[PDB]
From a paper:
Similarly, we have independently discovered a new lectin, actinohivin (hereafter designated AH), from an actinomycete, Longispora albida K97-0003T, which possesses a potent specific anti-HIV activity. This lectin inhibits the entry of various HIV-1 and HIV-­2 strains into susceptible cells, as well as T-­cell-tropic and macrophage-tropic syncytium formation, through binding to HMTGs of the HIV envelope glycoprotein gp120. Previous research suggested that the small lectin AH composed of 114 residues binds to three HMTGs at the D1 chain α(1–2)mannobiose (hereafter referred to as MB) moiety of the three branched chains of HMTG. The molecular structure of AH is composed of three structural modules associated with a pseudo-threefold symmetry based on tandem repeats in the sequence.
In the present study, we have successfully determined the crystal structure of AH in complex with MB. Therefore, it is considered that the three AH rotamers generated by ±120° rotation around the molecular pseudo-rotation axis are packed randomly in the unit cell according to the P212121 symmetry and that the whole crystal exhibits an apparent space group P213 as an averaged structure. For these reasons, the structure determination was performed under the constraints of space group P213 using the P213 data. The three MB molecules, each of which adopts a bracket-shaped conformation stabilized through two weak C—H⋯O hydrogen bonds, are separately bound in the three pockets, which are similar to each other in accordance with the molecular pseudo-threefold symmetry generated from the three tandem repeats in the amino-acid sequence. The second mannose residue (Man2) is accommodated by pushing one side (the C3, C4 and C5 atoms) of the hexose ring into the pocket and is trapped by four hydrogen bonds. Asp91 forms double hydrogen bonds to Man2, in which one of the two carboxyl O atoms accepts the hydroxyl group attached to the C3 atom of Man2 (O⋯O distance of 2.5 Å) and another O atom accepts the hydroxyl group at the C4 atom of the same Man2 (O⋯O distance of 2.7 Å). In addition, the O3 atom of Man2 accepts the carbamoyl amide N atom of Asn104 (N⋯O distance of 2.9 Å) and the O4 atom accepts the hydroxyl group of Tyr99 (O⋯O distance of 2.8 Å). It seems that the Tyr108 side chain wedges between the two Man residues to contact the C5 and C6 atoms through hydrophobic interaction. The methyl group of Leu101 faces the C3 atom of Man2 to block its movement, so that the hydroxyl group attached to the C1 atom in the axial configuration protrudes into the outside in an upwards direction. The K1 atom is bound to the three carbonyl O atoms of Asn28, Asn66 and Asn104 and to the three O2 atoms of the Man1 residues to form an octahedral coordination.
Residue numbers in the entry: 49 to 160
The structure:
Amino acid sequence: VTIRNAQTGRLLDSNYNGNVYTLPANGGNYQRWTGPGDGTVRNAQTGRCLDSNYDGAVYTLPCNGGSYQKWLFYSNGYIQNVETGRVLDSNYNGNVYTLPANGGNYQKWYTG
Ligand SMILES: OC[C@H]1O[C@H](O[C@H]2[C@@H](O)[C@H](O)[C@@H](CO)O[C@@H]2O)[C@@H](O)[C@@H](O)[C@@H]1O
Ligand SMILES: OC[C@H]1O[C@H](O[C@H]2[C@@H](O)[C@H](O)[C@@H](CO)O[C@@H]2O)[C@@H](O)[C@@H](O)[C@@H]1O
Ligand SMILES: OC[C@H]1O[C@H](O[C@H]2[C@@H](O)[C@H](O)[C@@H](CO)O[C@@H]2O)[C@@H](O)[C@@H](O)[C@@H]1O
Ligand SMILES: [K+]
Ligand SMILES: [K+]
Ligand SMILES: [K+]
């Protein structure tokens, strides 16, 4: 289902172009996500895998088995990219990107 930023209240969102962003909850399936158990976080509408790189950019692409598309969900709300180690982040404008863990609330996420 949904992934909601702890700082901004905006939810994790993505489209068929593979662009990612956050928006207020709006019921659409672009805002729900599925975790099979293989490390991936797949968009409920598109089936694509949330993914990022060493530059900090974050997008979705069809799923390819790479550590890049594998995420770790900690109980403190961090969502960590296995390859880079950088943590999923966003800003009130609805930018999504990754940055070094810095303890910030913009790096926390309620996932249900
Ligand atoms: O009208 C389409 C779409 O609008 C809203 O979706 C937005 C966003 O959440 C989706 O990620 C993108 C996908 O390109 O479209 C909008 O910006 C929701 O109402 C959604 O359910 C709906 O189909
Ligand atoms: O060979 C690099 C990388 O390729 C594939 O991952 C794609 C994408 O998911 C990644 O975010 C970017 C990283 O720059 O790379 C591709 O576009 C996977 O085959 C992956 O295992 C591999 O490391
Ligand atoms: O000092 C602002 C901000 O800095 C640190 O957060 C960084 C990053 O995680 C955020 O997404 C962006 C949002 O604009 O800001 C920094 O780049 C954190 O220490 C944070 O608590 C603080 O508000
Ligand atoms: K779209
Ligand atoms: K900090
Ligand atoms: K602050």
